Amino acid sequence: MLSGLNHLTLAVSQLAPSVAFYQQLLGMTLHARWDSGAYLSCGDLWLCLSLDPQRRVTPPEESDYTHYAFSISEADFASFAARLEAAGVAVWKLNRSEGASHYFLDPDGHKLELHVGSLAQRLAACREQPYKGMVFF
């Protein structure tokens, strides 16, 4: 039986700017670094950055919707978004769903999101206003 997400690994083209982005800009804790990667944590999340020459710096129009959302409180959301904006971090989508969301790109074009709200909150909103074809289990 699977019990959760064990780790998220992102392939990166240049390790130093990716470590700067996740540790310094995004505030994650750096636990270890080696010649070809790094381990960070963000709350319960174990993040691995893996240096990979096959990673392309990918424009958002050229990647699919796969993305990674990090939790933040409503109270902290606006100042964190403003920090990313000050740093010139690109946005790949505007929010049109329930719960605050800020959609931003990492240095290699990995699609990231800041989101406020749980699955339970999303399901409660969907029960009141179901998406087209929606069934609950």
Ligand X SMILES: COc1ccc2c(c1)NCCO2
Footprint of Mn ion (CB under 5 A): 9, 69, 113
d(CA 38, CA 109): 18
Q: How many CB atoms lie within 10 A of CB 38?
A: 22
Q: Which of 3, 61, 135, 136 lies at the binding interface for ligand X (CB under 6 A)?
A: 135
Taken in order 60, 65, 70, 73, is the CA torsion positive or negative? positive
Q: How many CB atoms lie within 10 A of CB 28?
A: 19
88 binding a second copy? (CB under 8 A) = no
Total site size for a second copy, rule CB under 8 A: 65
Please report how close the Cβ of residue 95 comes to a second copy at its closest, in angstroms.
13
Residue 35 CA, chain-centre distance (Å), reads 24
Interface residues toward a second copy, by CB under 8 A:
1-11, 26-28, 30-37, 39, 41-46, 50, 52, 54-56, 63-73, 76, 80, 110, 113-115, 117-119, 122-123, 126, 130-137
